[PDB]
Amino acid sequence: HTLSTLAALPAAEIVRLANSQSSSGLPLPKADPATVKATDDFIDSLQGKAAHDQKQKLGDQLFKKIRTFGVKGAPKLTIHLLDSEDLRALAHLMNSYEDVLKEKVQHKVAAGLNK
Amino acid sequence: DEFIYP
């Protein structure tokens, strides 16, 4: 499994593979548990809000993270990710698996989805 | 730059 083949999977499958430590070939670092719990508490905090309100609040952290990556069209990429992925899994890529997230964003830039 | 969900 390469980084690009992995970034091509849904966030929930990338994260599922991370936790099932048969990781003899998974280009993912060991997640920090204080970070994993802060992200899960954050997502817990959004349960019960309007879908629209949940994507805006997560989008805030997500857009800031894509702008660090150096990619143009980070709003459009941010919206597309929020509409195409599991919110909780995406936040785990954002805070814990940033390089996979970047490989996934390059896949979308390749589809002209930032334009 | 401001991020907003439509």
From Swiss-Prot, chain A:
| Signal sequence residues | none
Spell out the subcellular localization from the entry. Answer: Cytoplasm, Cytoskeleton; Endosome
Describe the outcome of a gene knockout.
Answer: Reduces filamentous growth and virulence. Disturbs polar growth of filaments.
Q: Which domain of life is it from?
A: Eukaryota
Which parts of the sequence belong to the PABC domain? 38-115
The UniProt family comment states: Belongs to the polyadenylate-binding protein type-1 family.
Oligomeric form and interacting partners: Part of large ribonucleoprotein complexes (mRNPs) containing RNA-binding proteins RRM4 and PAB1, endosome-binding protein UPA1, core scaffold protein UPA2 and associated factor GRP1. Interacts (via PABC domain) with UPA1 (via PAM2 domain).
Swiss-Prot/TrEMBL domain comment? The RRM1, RRM3 and PABC domains are important for RNA_binding and polar growth. RRM3 recognizes the specific binding motif UAUG of cargo mRNAs.
- Protein purpose: Key RNA-binding protein involved in the formation of polar-growing hyphae which is essential for infection by the plant pathogen. During filamentation, assembles into particles that shuttle bidirectionally along microtubules to both poles. The RRM4 transport particles are part of the endosomal mRNP transport that regulates polarity of the infectious hyphae by transporting distinct mRNAs encoding, for example, the ubiquitin fusion protein UBI1, the small G protein RHO3, or the septin CDC3, from the nucleus to cell poles.
Protein's UniProt name: RNA-binding protein RRM4
Q: What is the lineage of its organism?
A: Eukaryota, Fungi, Dikarya, Basidiomycota, Ustilaginomycotina
